[PDB]
Design a binder for this molecule. Sequence first.
Ligand SMILES: CCNC(=O)Nc1cccc2ccccc12
Ligand SMILES: CCNC(=O)Nc1cccc2ccccc12
Lengths: 318, 318
Amino acid sequence: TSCNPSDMSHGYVTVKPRVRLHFVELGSGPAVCLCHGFPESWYSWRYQIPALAQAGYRVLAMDMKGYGESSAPPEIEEYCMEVLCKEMVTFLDKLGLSQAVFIGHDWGGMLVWYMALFYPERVRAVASLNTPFIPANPNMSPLESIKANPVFDYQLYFQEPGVAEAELEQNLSRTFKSLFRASDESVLSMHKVCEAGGLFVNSPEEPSLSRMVTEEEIQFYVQQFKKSGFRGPLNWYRNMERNWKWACKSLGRKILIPALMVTAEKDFVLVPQMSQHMEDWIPHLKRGHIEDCGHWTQMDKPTEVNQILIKWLDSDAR
Amino acid sequence: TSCNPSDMSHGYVTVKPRVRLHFVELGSGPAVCLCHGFPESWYSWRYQIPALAQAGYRVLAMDMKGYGESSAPPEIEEYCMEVLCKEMVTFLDKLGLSQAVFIGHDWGGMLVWYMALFYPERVRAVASLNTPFIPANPNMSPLESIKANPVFDYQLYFQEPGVAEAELEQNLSRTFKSLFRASDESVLSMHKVCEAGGLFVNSPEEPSLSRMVTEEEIQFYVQQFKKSGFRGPLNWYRNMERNWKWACKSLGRKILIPALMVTAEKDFVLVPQMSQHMEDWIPHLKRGHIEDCGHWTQMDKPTEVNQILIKWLDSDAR
Ligand SMILES: CCNC(=O)Nc1cccc2ccccc12
Ligand SMILES: CCNC(=O)Nc1cccc2ccccc12
C-alpha cells in the first residue's frame, strides 16, 4: 500500500512570516512526525504513512524546509539545526500538540536527534533511520572531521553554492534515477567527488529505472523539485560551523526519552558501525537492523521498516 | 481566548475533482469536527477551537462547501444534504479517520443530524446548536410546511438565484453588521421578507457594531465572502425536495449514537420548542439550554457553549 498525492490531506503551518511548512496527514491517535532526508520529500514515507495510520497513529509526514510545497528562503543561516529545530517546535505549538513521536531519515534523522536533545518536553519518543547520534567534540573542528573519512567527499563539493545546484538541476529525471537505487544497482562513487567534477560522473546520460521505484514515482520528485530547486536542500550541509557550536552547548546532557536506532546494512556513507557506543549517551536506546538495505531505507525495504517502526511504537512509545 | 487566522494550521482535502474542503486544525486526541451555518465560516468557532483543544480534543473546524477557502461550484444540486454528507464521509476517509464527533450549528447542525442518521458508524457522537432533528413526513410537501410558518418567509426569498445574492453582496460590511447581532440588538424582521423585497429594509445603511463582534472580526467575514460570494451558501436552502426525498429513505430508524441538543432561548427562527419530542427518535439524547442567547450561539455565549460541549464530550463522546 502506497500514497496518492491527490487523495492525501495537505496541511500548511506558517511558523515564521517567511517560513510556511507543508505536511500530509493520515490516521488518528498519538501524533507521529515523519522527517525525510536529502534530496527527498514527504512522498519518501509513502509506504510508512498508511501502515502507521492503520496501526493506530496520527501520521504527520513533513516536507522539510526547502522541500516541495514548504518555504525555501535562499539564506544559508536559515538551514542550521538551531533554527530548523525551533520551527518544528513552533509547528507543534500552532497545531496544539504538546508532544509528538519524531521519526527521521538521513538529514531528518539528524534533526530528530537534536529535537530529542534540546526539546525532550516536546518529543514523546525518537526513531532514526541510518543517521546515528554522535555528541559534538569541543576539541575537534567540524571541517577536519569530514576530511578524515574519505566517504564524506561529496559534503565538501556541496559547500560552494551553485556548484552542486547546477549539476542536480541540469536533468531532474537523471538526478533521481541515479540517486534512488539499491546498493547493487548503484554506480555513484561517494569516496571521490571533488576530483571527479560532480556526483553523477560515473552515471550514464539515460540511466535505467531501479527496482524500488517506478516512472510515476520518479516524476513526482521531478515535479516537486521544479518549485524551489536544490539551493534550499543543499543549504542543510552548509551550516557545519553553526551546528557544531550549537551542539557543544548541550555537552553533558543525554537523550533520556525512548529511542530507536535503525541501521541499513548496505548504506556505505551512514554505515551501521557509526552507530556503535550510542547507548552510552542514550539509556533507553533500542535497535533495529535491515539486511540488503541501502541508503533509501523507506523505498528499499518498506515492509521491514513498517514492522520495526510499529513494534517499537506500540511497546516503547505507547 | 480567540483564533488568529495567520497562526492556524490550514488543512485541505480534495473529496471530488473540483471539490476541495478547507479546515483549521488544533489539539490532540479524539477528532472533533465543527460544522458552521449560514452565512458563516470556520471563524464562527473561534472561541470553541482553543477551548476544546485545551480540553484534550483534536479540533477540525470546517469551512463548509461554498464558504471561504473551500470550493464553491455554482450548481444548486451540489448543495443537497445527500451530496454534502457523502463528501464529509470521503473527508474522513482521506484523513484516515474511522470516527469523529460532529458538532454543528444552523445548516451545519442539519448536516450533523443527517451524518448521524445515515452514517452512525462514522459519527462517534453528535451535537447540534439550535438546529433540531425532525423526521421527514412522506405525506407532507416541503413547500407546504415552510409556507405554513410565518417565520420561514425569508427562505422563499432565498429560492430564486441571483435575487438574495445581489442584496447580500451589495455591501458586505453592512451584511455582517446587520446579521451578527444579539436578539435585543436585531434590526432584521424574518417575517414578511418577500413583501418588503429584501432582508435589509428596517436595517440602516450604516449599522452600529454589535456587543458580540469587533470591527476586525466583521472585516474577516467580508474578506472571506469576497472569494465566492453568496451563490454557494444560498444553494443550501435551494434543495428542499431533494433533502426531503433522501430523508424519507431512512423512515422509522432511530439515531442510536450519543446525541446533544443545545437550544438557544432567543433564537426566534430555530425556537427551543422545535426540539420537542426529539428523544422519541433519539433514545440517548442529552440536552443543553442557553438563556439570553440568540441565533449566533458561539458568538453570543462562548463561555456557556464551551462549558456545555466540554462536559458532554468528556461524559458521552469519550
Ligand atoms: C547527513 C548526511 N547524509 C547524506 O549526505 N546522505 C546522502 C545524501 C545524498 C546521496 C547519498 C547517497 C548515498 C548515501 C548517502 C547519501
Ligand atoms: C436552517 C435554517 N436556518 C436559517 O435560515 N438561519 C438563519 C440564517 C440567516 C439569518 C438568520 C437570522 C436570524 C435567525 C436565523 C437565521
